Amino acid sequence: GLVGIPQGLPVKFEENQPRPNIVIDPNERKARIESALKALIPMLSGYIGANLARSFPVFKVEELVAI
RNA sequence: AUUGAAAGUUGUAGUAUGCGGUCCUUGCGGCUGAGAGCACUUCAGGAGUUGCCCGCG
Known about the structure:
It comes from Pyrococcus furiosus (strain ATCC 43587 / DSM 3638 / JCM 8422 / Vc1). 21% of the residues lie in helices and 0% in strands. It is mainly α.
């Protein structure tokens, strides 16, 4: 939720509304959002750790809960 | 957004190569299921009986 929002300026708040201070373009902000979201796909698939060439761990997701 | 903030203990690596469970070896030689032995002894197909009855080439 803070992607593209400067840490020091969560909101700019000049028209008396606390709308987010999105200093960057909203479209590429959303693009960064789905890029970060899709970065999780090669995480629970077998692309974690070292010795990938020689080991490539035998991986499978057992169970999970997300909110 | 906590003396926290940025961060791969990282990348490349075959225990591998040749190595006969191998060569010889009889389950072999001798050996009577053999000798004795009545399907024997008694025995009627048996006792009765009109080819029957009439006859002019």
